[PDB]
Amino acid sequence: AAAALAAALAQAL
Ligand SMILES: *c1ccc([N+](=O)[O-])c2nonc12
């Protein structure tokens, strides 16, 4: 889950 989210945020920004 950590990675999923990490990646989400990365993309968002
Ligand atoms: C999660 C998984 C892979 C990568 N990546 O840089 O290839 C990520 N970057 O930020 N979160 C992830």
For the CA atoms of 6, 8, 12, 13, the dihedral, rounded to the nearest 10 degrees, stands at 20
Distance CA 12, CA 10 (A): 6
DSSP state of 13: -
Q: How far from 4 is each of 7, 10, CA to CA, in Å?
A: 5, 10
Method: X-ray
The kind and range of the H/E element at 1 are none
Q: Which residue has the tokens 């889950």?
A: 1
Distance CA 13, CA 5 (A): 12
Give, using CA atoms, the residue closest to atom 12 of ligand 1: 7
Give, using CA atoms, the residue closest to atom 11 of ligand 1: 7
Q: Separation of 3 CA from ligand 1 center, angstroms?
A: 6
Q: What tokens appear for 13 in the block? A: 């920004």
Q: Which atom of ligand 1 is nearest to the CA of 3?
A: 1
Q: Which residue has the tokens 């990675």?
A: 3
7, exposed or middle or buried, with CB in 10 Å at 0-12, 13-18, 19+? exposed
Coil/strand/helix, residue 3:
helix
Q: Resolution, rounded to a tenth of an Å?
A: 1.5
Distance CA 13, CA 4 (A): 15
